[PDB]
C-alpha cells in the first residue's frame, strides 16, 4: 500500500545558471518498494536519480544542471506511483542569472597625478558598493574619482553586489588593481644629503631611489668620480666633495646633492 503521507523533497530555493544542484526525494512506509516508480523532474527536465532502497522505503538523490534555457521559476516535483495510488510533492525553485560585477578602469596603467575614475556596473535589480561606498548598497552601479598618487600603485578596487532572488540576498564581488607609474624620487630618508666620516674608516654610503618602474641610480662628482653606493669602502680624502646623484627612469629624472666630509684624524 502507498501511505497518505507525501514524499519529502529537499532542494535549494534558488540555483545559479550554469551550475549543478542537488535534489533528494524520500518516502517511508510503502510496499512493495520494488514495484514503486519514482518520477523526479525539474519543470520539463526529467531527472535521473540514483535510488537507495530499504525494505519499506526509498531515497532518491539526483544532480541537476541548469542553463539559460532554465532561467526563471521552475517547478521541482517528486511523484511516486504504486499501482493505483499516487503521491506527489511540489516545490518551487528559481533559476537566476547573476554575473559578477564589472569593476572597470578607464586605463589599467596610468601616470602620477592623472584623473582616474573607477566604475562598477552589475545586474539591473542588484545593488552595488565600491570599496564600502555607498555604505548600505543602493542602485546597480557606483563611481569613485581619484587623483592618482604613488600610494595608489597596486591599490585594489573591490566591488560587492547583492541580488534579491526569491526572498533571499545573493552576494558576489569583484576586485581589480590599479597600476600607477610615478617619476623618480630621491627621498632624504633613503638618501641623505650630508655625510661626515673619519679618515681611514670603513663606511657604506647609502642612497636608494623610489619610482615605478625602479629608477637607475648614479652619483658622481668632479665629472665621473663614482660614489660606491651599497659597498663598504675605506674613507679617504679622495672621496671628499659634493656628489650629484641622478635617478633615472621612463617617468622622468631627479637629482640630489650629497656632500661627503672627511674628518682628519
Amino acid at each position: 500500500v502507498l501511505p497518505a503521507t507525501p514524499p519529502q523533497l529537499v532542494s535549494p530555493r534558488v540555483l545559479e545558471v550554469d551550475t549543478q544542484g542537488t535534489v533528494v526525494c524520500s518516502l517511508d512506509g510503502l510496499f512493495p518498494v520494488s514495484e514503486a516508480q519514482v518520477h523526479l523532474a525539474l519543470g520539463d527536465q526529467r531527472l535521473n536519480p540514483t535510488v537507495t532502497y530499504g525494505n519499506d522505503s526509498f531515497s532518491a538523490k539526483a544532480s541537476v544542471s541548469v542553463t539559460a534555457e532554465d532561467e526563471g521559476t521552475q517547478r521541482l516535483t517528486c511523484a511516486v506511483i504504486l499501482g493505483n495510488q499516487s503521491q506527489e510533492t511540489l516545490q518551487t525553485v528559481t533559476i537566476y542569472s547573476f554575473p559578477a560585477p564589472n569593476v572597470i578602469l578607464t586605463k589599467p596603467e596610468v601616470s602620477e597625478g592623472t584623473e582616474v575614475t573607477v566604475k562598477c556596473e552589475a545586474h539591473p535589480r542588484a545593488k552595488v558598493t565600491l570599496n564600502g561606498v555607498p555604505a548600505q548598497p543602493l542602485g546597480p552601479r557606483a563611481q569613485l574619482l581619484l587623483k592618482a598618487t604613488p600610494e595608489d600603485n597596486g591599490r585594489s578596487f573591490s566591488c560587492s553586489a547583492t541580488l534579491e532572488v526569491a526572498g533571499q540576498l545573493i552576494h558576489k564581488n569583484q576586485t581589480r588593481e590599479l597600476r600607477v607609474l610615478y617619476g623618480p624620487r630621491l627621498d632624504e630618508r633613503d638618501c641623505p644629503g650630508n655625510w661626515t666620516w673619519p679618515e681611514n674608516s670603513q663606511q657604506t654610503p647609502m642612497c636608494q631611489a623610489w619610482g615605478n618602474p625602479l629608477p637607475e641610480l648614479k652619483c658622481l662628482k668632479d665629472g665621473t668620480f663614482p660614489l660606491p653606493i651599497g659597498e663598504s669602502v675605506t674613507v679617504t680624502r679622495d672621496l671628499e666633495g659634493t656628489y650629484l646623484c641622478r635617478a633615472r627612469s621612463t617617468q622622468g629624472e631627479v637629482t640630489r646633492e650629497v656632500t661627503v666630509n672627511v674628518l682628519s684624524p
Epitope: 630618508r189 633613503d190 655625510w195 647609502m206 636608494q208 651599497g230
Partner: antibody, heavy 114, light 108 residues
Framework: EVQLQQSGPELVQPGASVKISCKTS????????MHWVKQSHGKSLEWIGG????????SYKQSFKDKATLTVDKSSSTAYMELNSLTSEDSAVYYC???????WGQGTLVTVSA | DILLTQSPAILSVSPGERVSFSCRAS??????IHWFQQRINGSPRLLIE???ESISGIPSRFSGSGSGTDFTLTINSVESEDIADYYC?????????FGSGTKLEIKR
C-alpha cells in the same frame, strides 16, 4: 595592502643569538630601504641600522656595530636582522620599517634570560 | 649625533582642547623632522612628514610646523582615542634619532 610580517616572540640564553625575519608583501621590495628600530620597555625608540634592498649594503649605528647584522633575501622579499652576544640590555621589542618609516612591522619581543 | 629633546613628558588634557607637542633639536636641521603616534601594544604611526607635510589617511586635526631647531605638533580638537605616545624623529643626518617622547592623557 602593505604588510611587514615579523617572526614573533623569542626567548634566548645570554650569549646566544637570534635572527628576526621580516617577510614583506604588497610592494616592490627592492624599491625602499629597510630600517630596523629597537624599543626598550622604558619606551624609547632607537634606530639600529638600515639595509639597501638592491645590493645588500648595510649601515649601522655605532652602538649596534658587531651586535646587529642586517641581511636580505630578495627572491622571498624578506629582511633578516641577527643579534649576537645577547645580554639583558638587548631585551626589547624590535621593529622592521620601510618607505621612510611609513610602514612598520608588528614588532618582535626578544627576551634574554637564563 | 643630532639630539632631540621633547617636552613635556606628560600632557594631560580634556577633549576638545588644542594641545601642542614641542621638539627641540641640538643642531639646525632645516625641516627634516617627522612625527609618530604610538598607541599601547602597537607599532609607531607616521602622522606628519618633514615638519608640516601631511600623510594620507591621517585625521585633519593633526598638523605640524617649525624649521631649524624648534618644531611643533598640534592637535586642533583632541579626542579620546588620541591617547598615545608621540615621538619626533629627525632625518637630516644618519643615524636617525627620536625624541624622548610625550604622553597624551585624557581628562574625564
Amino acid at each position: 595592502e602593505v604588510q611587514l610580517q615579523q617572526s614573533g616572540p623569542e626567548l634566548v640564553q645570554p650569549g646566544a643569538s637570534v635572527k628576526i625575519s621580516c617577510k614583506t608583501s604588497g610592494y616592490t621590495f627592492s624599491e625602499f630601504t629597510m630600517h630596523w628600530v629597537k624599543q626598550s620597555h622604558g619606551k624609547s625608540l632607537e634606530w639600529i641600522g638600515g639595509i639597501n634592498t638592491i645590493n645588500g649594503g648595510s649601515s649601522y649605528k655605532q652602538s649596534f656595530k658587531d651586535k646587529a647584522t642586517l641581511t636580505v633575501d630578495k627572491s622571498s622579499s624578506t629582511a633578516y636582522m641577527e643579534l649576537n652576544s645577547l645580554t639583558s640590555e638587548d631585551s626589547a621589542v624590535y621593529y622592521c620599517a620601510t618607505k621612510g618609516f611609513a610602514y612598520w612591522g608588528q614588532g618582535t619581543l626578544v627576551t634574554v634570560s637564563a | 649625533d643630532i639630539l632631540l629633546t621633547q617636552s613635556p613628558a606628560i600632557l594631560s588634557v580634556s577633549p576638545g582642547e588644542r594641545v601642542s607637542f614641542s621638539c627641540r633639536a641640538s643642531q639646525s636641521i632645516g625641516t627634516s623632522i617627522h612625527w609618530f603616534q604610538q598607541r599601547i601594544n602597537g607599532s609607531p604611526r607616521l602622522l606628519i612628514e618633514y615638519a608640516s607635510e601631511s600623510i594620507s589617511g591621517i585625521p585633519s586635526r593633526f598638523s605640524g610646523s617649525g624649521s631649524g631647531t624648534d618644531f611643533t605638533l598640534t592637535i586642533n580638537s583632541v579626542e579620546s582615542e588620541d591617547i598615545a605616545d608621540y615621538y619626533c624623529q629627525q632625518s637630516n643626518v644618519w643615524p636617525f634619532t627620536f625624541g624622548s617622547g610625550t604622553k597624551l592623557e585624557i581628562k574625564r
